[PDB]
Amino acid sequence: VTQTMKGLDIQKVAGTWYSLAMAASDISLLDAQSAPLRVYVEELKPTPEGDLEILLQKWENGECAQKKIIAEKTKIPAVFKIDALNENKVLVLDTDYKKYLLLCMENQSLACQCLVRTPEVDDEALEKFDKALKALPMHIRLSFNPTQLEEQCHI
Amino acid sequence: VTQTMKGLDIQKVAGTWYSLAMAASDISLLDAQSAPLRVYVEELKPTPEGDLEILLQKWENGECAQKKIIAEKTKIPAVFKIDALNENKVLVLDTDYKKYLLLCMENQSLACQCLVRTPEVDDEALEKFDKALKALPMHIRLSFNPTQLEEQCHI
């Protein structure tokens, strides 16, 4: 992953998002509802201390569970660290704050999402996502329709 | 980790266990209630197809959440694979089935537990655990008293 957002204003990513598309380096990271990186972003909550709280939905044990994870700020503004078994980095590739945000989670092993502010298919944003991923070795890509985007876990 | 159980009968590990002691390669894997490997085993559920279901408690977002994870069998009987972002292996080091079980989760980065069948301090089992870990680079060790062992998340 050699694409970060220059000048990222993390405060400006706050609020509602929709996981419009996801991709990952390994099919098994996204293939099933229960797959480990099949997570649906609900809301980004930057903290005063500049960390990024992520609210998301994950299908776990047959139910659509709300989750909250804190990605801790690093010296690089577009890079955040999740404390888990592996060293797990969240990268903001690109965002206009108002329509779309591209972000990846890595560690090598990678998942990236195209987040949008509305439950609409944003071709422009999907173009920027496909662009960024041409640079990356992805073997599964999913996308969701507006009906799915208004449902718990995109059912 | 160069200690597996020779001759492991995975069916025989079924039932109740108590996470009497835990250790990990990195302090931050176990330090807080919310730490990523601070998990309390409730029950091991081997499947007919020889996989290992693990029921456990984890303190997440200030609540003691029940979790169920499936560690898939490999060609090695004392080694099981969890599908997650990293390649994550569960190793059965040693067990008498009736009193104690030692198991580790690795990937390098490691957490090991001394499981017991009863909410009792088993010095013999804690000796076998310390033995096995002398072989391993651990920087945090926790242990719980019988009162803690009878509580949700060992509070």
Domains of chain A: 1-155 (2.40.128.20)
B28 contacts A85? CB cut-off 8 A:
no
Query: What whole-number distance in Å separates Cα of residue B145 and Cα of residue B63?
Result: 21
Query: Residue type at A130?
Result: D
Pick the closest to residue B17 from B49, B39, B47, B50 (CA basis). B39
CA dist A80 to A52, A74, A91, A105, B37, Å?
Answer: 7, 6, 6, 9, 20
B68 contacts A85? CB cut-off 8 A:
no
Query: What whole-number distance in Å separates Cα of residue A116 and Cα of residue A121?
Result: 9
Query: What whole-number distance in Å separates Cα of residue A131 and Cα of residue A23?
Result: 12
Say what the resolution is, in angstroms.
2.0
Chain B's closest residue to A68, CA to CA, is: B61
Contact B99, B128 (CB under 8 A): no
Contact A97, A9 (CB under 8 A): yes
A7: left (phi over 0), alpha (psi -120 to 50) or beta: left
Query: What whole-number distance in Å separates Cα of residue B24 and Cα of residue B111?
Result: 4
Instruction: Find the discontinuities in chain B where C to next N exceeds 2.5 angstroms and give the residue preceding each.
Output: 107
Pick the closest to residue A118 from A8, A20, A5, A44 (CA basis). A20
Contact A20, A116 (CB under 8 A): yes
CB atoms within 10 A of CB A111: 23
Pairing of strands B140-143, B15-16: unpaired
Query: What whole-number distance in Å separates Cα of residue A72 and Cα of residue A58?
Result: 21
Three-state DSSP class for residue B6: coil
Chain B's closest residue to A32, CA to CA, is: B83
Q: What is the H or E stretch that residue B20 is in? A: strand B18-24
Provide residues of B within 8 Å CB-CB of chain A. 28-29, 35-37, 60-61, 67-68, 83-86, 88, 105, 107, 109, 111
Three-state DSSP class for residue A70: strand
CA angle B103, B30, B97 (to 5 degrees): 20
Q: How was this structure determined?
A: X-ray
Pick the closest to residue B120 from B34, B20, B40 (CA basis). B20
CA atoms within a 13 Å half-sphere pointing along the CA-CB vector of A73: 14
- Give the distance from residue A85's alpha carbon to the nearest chain B alpha carbon, in angstroms: 7
Quick one: three-class SS letters along B88-120?
Answer: EEEEEEEECCCCEEEEEEECCCEEEEEEECCCC
Pairing of strands B87-95, B100-106: antiparallel
Structure tokens at B73: 């069998």
How many Å is the maximal CA-CA distance in chain B?
41
Chain A's closest residue to B70, CA to CA, is: A61
- Give the distance from residue A67's alpha carbon to the nearest chain B alpha carbon, in angstroms: 8
Query: What whole-number distance in Å separates Cα of residue A130 and Cα of residue A34?
Result: 24
